[PDB]
Amino acid sequence: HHAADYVLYKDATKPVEDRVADLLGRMTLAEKIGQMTQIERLVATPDVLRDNFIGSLLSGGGSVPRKGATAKEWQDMVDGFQKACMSTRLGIPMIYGIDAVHGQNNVYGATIFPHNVGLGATRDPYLVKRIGEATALEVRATGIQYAFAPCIAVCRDPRWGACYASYSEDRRIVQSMTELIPGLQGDVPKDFTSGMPFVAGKNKVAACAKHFVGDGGTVDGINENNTIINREGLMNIHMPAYKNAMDKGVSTVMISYSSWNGVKMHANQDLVTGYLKDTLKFKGFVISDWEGIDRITTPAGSDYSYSVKASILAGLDMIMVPNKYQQFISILTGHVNGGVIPMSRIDDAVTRILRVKFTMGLFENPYADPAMAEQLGKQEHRDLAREAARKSLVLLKNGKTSTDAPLLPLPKKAPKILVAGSHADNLGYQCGGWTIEWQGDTGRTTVGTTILEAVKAAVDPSTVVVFAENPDAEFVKSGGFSYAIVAVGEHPYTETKGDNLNLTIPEPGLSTVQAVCGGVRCATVLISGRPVVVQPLLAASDALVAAWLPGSEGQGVTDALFGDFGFTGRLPRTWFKSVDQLPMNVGDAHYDPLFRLGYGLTTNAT
Ligand SMILES: CO[C@@H]1O[C@H](CS[C@@H]2O[C@H](CO)[C@@H](O)[C@H](O)[C@H]2O)[C@@H](O)[C@H](O)[C@H]1O
Ligand SMILES: *[C@@H]1O[C@H](CO)[C@@H](O)[C@H](O)[C@H]1NC(C)=O
Ligand SMILES: *[C@@H]1O[C@H](CO)[C@@H](O)[C@H](O)[C@H]1NC(C)=O
Ligand SMILES: *[C@@H]1O[C@H](CO)[C@@H](O)[C@H](O)[C@H]1NC(C)=O
């Protein structure tokens, strides 16, 4: 369709399927296996990208150009890499991926939304969609086109260190929250075929339903372990949200480290090809987890040649290598050269990677929009995050007897108030895992508002606010306080580091609450990624709030404490009496909760 140097795949007016087929038919084996290769930015250089025909890059947790980098620095790094890819013979742009799982959370000054467990408390899919929209703007502000989200794990045991990344133990709440997908990607057309990938264009990102499948169902919530359950139960609990994701055009699926009934997901042809591709009709690309194929064997990495054979024959399309791309390319090349992996398997993987790249507009807009840089940390997104934090909060108790004056809401005007606890003035603690660093971090790691700063911003100017992190009983009894707000809880963690059999918060925590609440009426704010042992915190507290991991906008806590808004959140998980009861989920024969799924006390706006 015109000029003498005309190449169909480069024509933006031709249909995706014709541009894919036109490009695939021109590629060498090296170009094909290049597309199937994702590498860390930490090992990428122009020459590596160009000479290996690399298809994708990622930032893993904490993989950043430097500490405190601006949105423009991120854009320049991504463009740098993309310039190299676009200089290859075929000019195939790379897709850059990142864990934007509660905002663009590796980026300094990015808005940090509550983690998924808290969003589950909101029962507000439309709020989660809005979070998806804001996240896509903030990811595109940094030049990135691909978010590894959403986690549609169904956590069935809160000893799992990723329990906070699950919206709920109820598959129905996880299904409702797949509205994240059309937030990140855009709404699919009215006509849409379930399983086709979709991204609206340069102001949206590709999404990733992960981790397929049963990441939330491991024995003793041990991260990466064995999910022991029959076909009926995998299909009734862990699968359904994958179908919702297909209907909303999720562009990719990341495979789980976990096994189903002793079979590595990363080697499971029946589930990856039989079910996801041939039954659910997935037409996007399937990506590995991080060294996922390496972990097929025991030990991990002890037969990479197997790892490649088993993972690629199971139907995986793109491999998050992510460092040793030379070994990955050499070994897949040999298996194809020896007839062990047929060319048709390579062509199907490359067809799906190119389908996603063409669909999402990457060949038309391979470079970053410098005008999107101001989207990062935009006050409108913060206001959204604040709304979400507030709606996430679950009021567990509001008066020590039925007869007491309810403590909440608190008055903004009082002569003197106490704000206390390890978590009252710690932005890192309130964001948790996957914030600036992989495992999250302590203190003032990014832009935000702690509980202490929110209280000072909220109260009447005549109200004297005293901060003491760990005050003793005498300090409180002598200080002349009207009331105390005390904030304690879990430290930041992710995945295996947060696997935890006893689920009790670190000291000082209980001690500071007992010391404070012993001397003056107290509202306790519990910062956690999951239910933890709570009876002793309750027994001491006049009121207690489960705030989960509310993110950067701490004023969402104070919006409810002080009666600007009523408490509306409902537990999206069972709150246990004792860890010995676990696993224990809404529905089981032997169901004895401290607080059932769906519990939450209410208040009214003053
Ligand atoms: C992420 O940085 C490196 O991360 C892994 C955590 S694992 C895996 O990472 C994927 C890509 O970041 C995520 O999308 C996925 O949900 C996770 O399961 C860790 O092993 C490395 O030590 C860390 O450097
Ligand atoms: C589960 O964890 C144990 C150790 O805690 C490990 O040795 C075993 O191989 C794991 N099982 C699976 C199938 O991943
Ligand atoms: C409980 O488990 C965690 C993680 O394994 C551990 O760090 C913590 O010290 C333990 N707590 C108690 C009370 O033993
Ligand atoms: C809160 O408002 C509800 C809804 O009308 C009402 O039933 C309840 O009595 C109110 N409680 C307080 C403490 O104002």
Numbering used by the authors: -3 to 602
Paper lines:
We use the high-resolution X-ray crystallography supported with enzyme kinetics, mass spectrometry, nuclear magnetic resonance (NMR) spectroscopy, multi-scale molecular modelling employing docking, Molecular dynamics (MD) simulations, Genetic Algorithms with Unrestricted Descriptors for Intuitive Molecular Modelling (GaudiMM)20 and Protein Energy Landscape Exploration (PELE)21 calculations, to reveal the Glc product displacement route, and to extract how each hydrolytic event including Glc release is precisely coordinated with the incoming substrate association and hydrolysis. This leads us to generate a variant enzyme and probe it for Glc entrapment and the S-glycoside analogue binding. Strikingly, when the toll-like barrier is disrupted in the R158A/E161A variant, Glc no longer binds in the active site, which underlines the vital role of the barrier in Glc entrapment.
HvExoI releases a single Glc from non-reducing termini of oligo- and polymeric β-d-glucosides to support seed germination and plant development. HvExoI folds in an (α/β)8 barrel (domain 1) and an (α/β)6 sandwich (domain 2) that at their interface cradle a 13 Å-deep pocket- or crater-shaped active site. A vital conclusion drawn from the structural studies with the native β-d-glucan glucohydrolase, isoenzyme ExoI (HvExoI) isolated from barley seedlings, was that the glucose (Glc) product released from β-d-glucoside substrates remains entrapped in the enzyme active site until an incoming substrate binds, presumably lowering the energy barrier to facilitate Glc displacement. We discover that through chemical signalling, the incoming substrate evokes the formation of an autonomous and transient lateral cavity that serves as a conduit for the Glc product displacement from the active site.
